[PDB]
From Swiss-Prot, chain A:
Mapped HEAT repeat ranges: 8-45, 88-125
Tissue expr: Predominantly expressed in the upper one-third of the oxyntic mucosa and in most regions of the pyloric mucosa. Ubiquitously expressed including platelet, liver, heart, spleen, lung and kidney.
Cell compartments where the protein resides: Cytoplasm; Golgi apparatus membrane; Cytoplasmic vesicle, COPI-coated vesicle membrane; Cell membrane
Highest taxon listed in the record's lineage: Eukaryota
Full-protein positions shown: 309 to 469 of 953
Quaternary structure, from the entry: Oligomeric complex that consists of at least the alpha, beta, beta', gamma, delta, epsilon and zeta subunits. Interacts with CAPN8. Interacts with SCYL1 and PRKCE. Interacts with COPG1. Interacts with ARF1 (myristoylated); this interaction is required for binding of COPB1 to Golgi membranes. Interacts (via trunk domain) with ARF1 (via switch I region); the interaction is direct. Interacts with KCNK2 (via N-terminus); this interaction increases the channel-mediated whole cell currents and promotes plasma membrane expression of KCNK2. Interacts with STX17. Interacts with TMEM115.
Protein name per the record: Coatomer subunit beta
Residue runs in coiled coils: none
Function: The coatomer is a cytosolic protein complex that binds to dilysine motifs and reversibly associates with Golgi non-clathrin-coated vesicles, which further mediate biosynthetic protein transport from the ER, via the Golgi up to the trans Golgi network. Coatomer complex is required for budding from Golgi membranes, and is essential for the retrograde Golgi-to-ER transport of dilysine-tagged proteins.
Miscellaneous comment in the UniProt entry for this protein: Brefeldin A induces dissociation from the Golgi of the beta-COP and presumably the other coatomer subunits.
Curated annotation (Swiss-Prot), chain B:
Gene: Copg1
First-to-last residue of the parent protein present: 438 to 549 of 874
Protein origin, superkingdom: Eukaryota
Functional note: The coatomer is a cytosolic protein complex that binds to dilysine motifs and reversibly associates with Golgi non-clathrin-coated vesicles, which further mediate biosynthetic protein transport from the ER, via the Golgi up to the trans Golgi network. Coatomer complex is required for budding from Golgi membranes, and is essential for the retrograde Golgi-to-ER transport of dilysine-tagged proteins.
Family: Belongs to the COPG family.
Known partners and oligomeric status: Oligomeric complex that consists of at least the alpha, beta, beta', gamma, delta, epsilon and zeta subunits. Interacts with ZNF289/ARFGAP2 through its C-terminal appendage domain. Interacts with EGFR upon EGF treatment; interaction is essential for regulation of EGF-dependent nuclear transport of EGFR by retrograde trafficking from the Golgi to the ER. The coatomer interacts with KDEL receptors; the interaction is important for retrograde trafficking of KDEL-bearing proteins from the Golgi to the endoplasmic reticulum. Interacts with COPB1. Interacts with TMED10 (via C-terminus).
Name of this chain's protein: Coatomer subunit gamma-1
Compartments, record wording: Cytoplasm, Cytosol; Golgi apparatus membrane; Cytoplasmic vesicle, COPI-coated vesicle membrane
Length: 161, 112
């Protein structure tokens, strides 16, 4: 990689390779994700993102996660980073949705992590929708996690007086 | 004995009860450093909740102050402070609450 003359393309070929991952082995996959993250100057991105979303669908599937779960968390990390740099998009909205589906803490933690972050980040607009989304999600749901969720959000508050 | 043992004799539930009681008692029985010493410990434990009691007990206490407390009482809330969002909030809020009344007044209303 310390061929820091680091050509565009090469980074790009990864996905192809990556496709192969669907024949799992997380551990390998995991190595990939880290590896993967790196190349992206917040670009070859979309095609990827899309692909990620594909992954995401794929991730849904019917699953009996045991290994891939892990991956997900990781992915999200990997993913997280990018965003920091980037301006990101709808894809993201989808996580929010996605997250609603889900049922385990670690994600909530991420989410929360996001809570924090976003709290810092504020360009805002999205949030509001999402807040709406959430409103649904929320209405649509119960749990400690949620319960907790409410608290912060509540804490947060703005309009629709 | 209670303090120590309970610490390493566990059960959160006990703590609730005792907390509540202790909550009232404070500086009428002095021994500040120790008592502080304890109090810190009680908090030490995780649980936003476990942590929380030491502050609440404190309100009757703080207000009264003891063999050294008012100046310092003021200093302490500052020295000990926390994030963890709603745990953050607890610190912030108590503060914020604190922020909101002349602390002398503050003590009077809340206490009752």
């Amino acid at each position: 990689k310390e061929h820091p003359a680091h050509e565009r393309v090469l980074q790009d070929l990864v996905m192809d390779i990556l496709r192969v991952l669907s024949t799992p082995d997380l551990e390998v996959r995991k190595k990939t994700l880290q590896l993967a993250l790196d190349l992206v100057s917040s670009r070859n991105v979309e095609e990827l993102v899309i692909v990620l979303k594909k992954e995401v669908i794929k991730t849904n599937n019917v699953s009996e996660h045991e290994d891939t779960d892990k991956y997900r968390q990781l992915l999200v990390r990997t993913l997280h980073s990018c965003s920091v740099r980037f301006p990101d998009m709808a894809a993201n909205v989808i996580p929010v949705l996605m997250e609603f589906l889900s049922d385990s803490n670690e994600a909530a933690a991420a989410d929360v992590l996001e809570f924090v972050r976003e709290a810092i980040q504020r360009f805002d607009n999205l949030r509001m929708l999402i807040v709406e989304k959430m409103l649904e999600v929320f209405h649509a749901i119960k749990s400690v996690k949620i319960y907790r969720g409410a608290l912060w959000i509540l804490g947060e508050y703005c309009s629709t007086k | 004995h209670l303090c120590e043992f309970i610490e390493d004799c566990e059960f959160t539930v006990l703590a609730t009860r005792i907390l509540h009681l202790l909550g009232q008692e404070g500086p009428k029985t002095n021994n500040p450093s120790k008592y502080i010493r304890f109090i810190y410990n009680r908090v030490v434990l995780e649980h936003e909740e476990v942590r929380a009691g030491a502050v609440s007990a404190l309100a009757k206490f703080g207000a009264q102050n003891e063999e050294m407390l008012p100046s310092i009482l003021v200093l302490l809330k500052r020295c000990v402070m926390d994030d963890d969002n709603e745990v953050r909030d607890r610190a912030t809020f108590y503060l914020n609450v604190l922020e909101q009344k002349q602390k002398a007044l503050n003590a009077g209303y809340i206490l009752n």
